[PDB]
Scaffold this active site. Structure first.
Site, short mmCIF file in Angstrom:
data_model
loop_
_atom_site.label_atom_id
_atom_site.label_comp_id
_atom_site.label_asym_id
_atom_site.label_seq_id
_atom_site.Cartn_x
_atom_site.Cartn_y
_atom_site.Cartn_z
N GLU A 11 0.78 -1.23 0.00
CA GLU A 11 0.00 0.00 0.00
C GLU A 11 0.81 1.27 0.00
O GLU A 11 0.28 2.32 -0.31
CB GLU A 11 -0.88 0.06 1.25
CG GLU A 11 -1.85 -1.10 1.32
CD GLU A 11 -3.01 -0.90 0.37
OE1 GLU A 11 -2.92 0.20 -0.34
OE2 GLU A 11 -3.90 -1.70 0.26
N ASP A 20 -6.73 6.41 -4.57
CA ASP A 20 -6.19 5.09 -4.73
C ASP A 20 -6.30 4.65 -6.20
O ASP A 20 -6.67 5.46 -7.03
CB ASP A 20 -6.77 4.11 -3.69
CG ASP A 20 -8.21 3.69 -3.91
OD1 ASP A 20 -8.75 4.17 -4.97
OD2 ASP A 20 -8.79 2.89 -3.22
N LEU A 32 -8.92 3.76 3.35
CA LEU A 32 -9.98 4.35 2.54
C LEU A 32 -10.71 5.42 3.33
O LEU A 32 -11.10 5.19 4.44
CB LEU A 32 -10.97 3.27 2.03
CG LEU A 32 -12.20 3.84 1.32
CD1 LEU A 32 -11.79 4.47 0.00
CD2 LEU A 32 -13.19 2.72 1.02
N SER A 117 -12.30 -20.23 -5.18
CA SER A 117 -10.88 -20.22 -4.78
C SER A 117 -10.74 -20.58 -3.32
O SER A 117 -9.81 -21.26 -2.90
CB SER A 117 -10.24 -18.85 -4.96
OG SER A 117 -10.51 -18.36 -6.24
N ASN A 132 -7.20 -20.23 -10.33
CA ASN A 132 -8.55 -19.66 -10.17
C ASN A 132 -8.50 -18.23 -9.64
O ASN A 132 -9.27 -17.34 -10.01
CB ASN A 132 -9.37 -20.56 -9.19
CG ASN A 132 -10.83 -20.25 -9.21
OD1 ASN A 132 -11.37 -19.54 -8.35
ND2 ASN A 132 -11.51 -20.74 -10.25
#
Ligand code: CL
Ligand code: CL
Length: 162
Positions: A11, A20, A32, A117, A132
Site C-alpha cells: 500500500e 487510490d 480508505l 478459490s 482460479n
C-alpha cells in the site's frame, strides 16, 4: 516478514489525502476515507478518524495508528465471517497473511465472493487455487500486487516480497 511489513509494501505510505487505484480518497497506509467524489467529504472523514482538524494532512504516527486499527479490524472481520473463518483457520501462518492482505484491499464482502478459490484453498490445492484466483477483475486491475499475493498462497513462503 509479517502482515504489517507486507501491507506496508503493498500500500505504501502517504501523509496527504490521495486517490487510490480506483480513484477513491485515501490516506496513510491504504486507509480508505470515502467513495464519495467530494474532497470535503474526505477531509471531514479524515478529521473524524484522527480526532482533530487535520487540514488533509497527518503525521506518521497518526498513519500508523490508523494502520493498527485497520489490521486488527480486518482480522476480526475475518473471524466473524462464516465464509472466511473456516478458510482462515485451515491455513498456515504465511498463507493467513495473504488472506488478510486480500481483505484489507477489497473488504470482507469482496473476498467472500471468491467462493471457488476459497474452497480450493481450504482443500490445500495450491496450484489450482492460484490459477482460479487469477481469473478475476482483481488480478486484471492490480496484477503486480495480485501476483505477489497469489504466489504467497501457492508457495506458502514470503519469496514474492523479498
Ligand atoms: Cl477510522
Ligand atoms: Cl498492481
Amino acid at each position: 516478514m509479517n502482515i504489517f511489513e507486507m501491507l506496508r509494501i503493498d500500500e505504501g505510505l502517504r501523509l496527504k489525502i490521495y486517490k487510490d487505484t480506483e480513484g477513491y480518497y485515501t490516506i496513510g497506509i491504504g486507509h480508505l476515507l470515502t467513495k464519495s467524489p467530494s474532497l470535503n467529504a474526505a477531509k471531514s472523514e479524515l478529521d473524524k478518524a484522527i480526532g482533530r482538524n487535520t487540514n488533509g494532512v497527518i503525521t506518521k504516527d497518526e498513519a500508523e495508528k490508523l494502520f493498527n486499527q485497520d489490521v486488527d479490524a480486518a482480522v476480526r472481520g475475518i473471524l466473524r465471517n462464516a465464509k472466511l473463518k473456516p478458510v482462515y483457520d485451515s491455513l498456515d501462518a504465511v498463507r493467513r497473511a495473504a488472506l488478510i492482505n486480500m481483505v484489507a484491499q477489497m473488504g470482507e464482502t469482496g473476498v467472500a465472493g471468491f467462493t471457488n478459490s476459497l474452497r480450493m484453498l481450504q482443500q490445500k490445492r495450491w496450484d489450482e487455487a492460484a490459477v482460479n484466483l487469477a481469473k478475476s477483475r482483481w488480478y486484471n486491475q492490480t496484477p503486480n500486487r495480485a501476483k505477489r499475493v497469489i504466489t504467497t498462497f501457492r508457495t506458502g513462503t514470503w519469496d514474492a516480497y523479498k
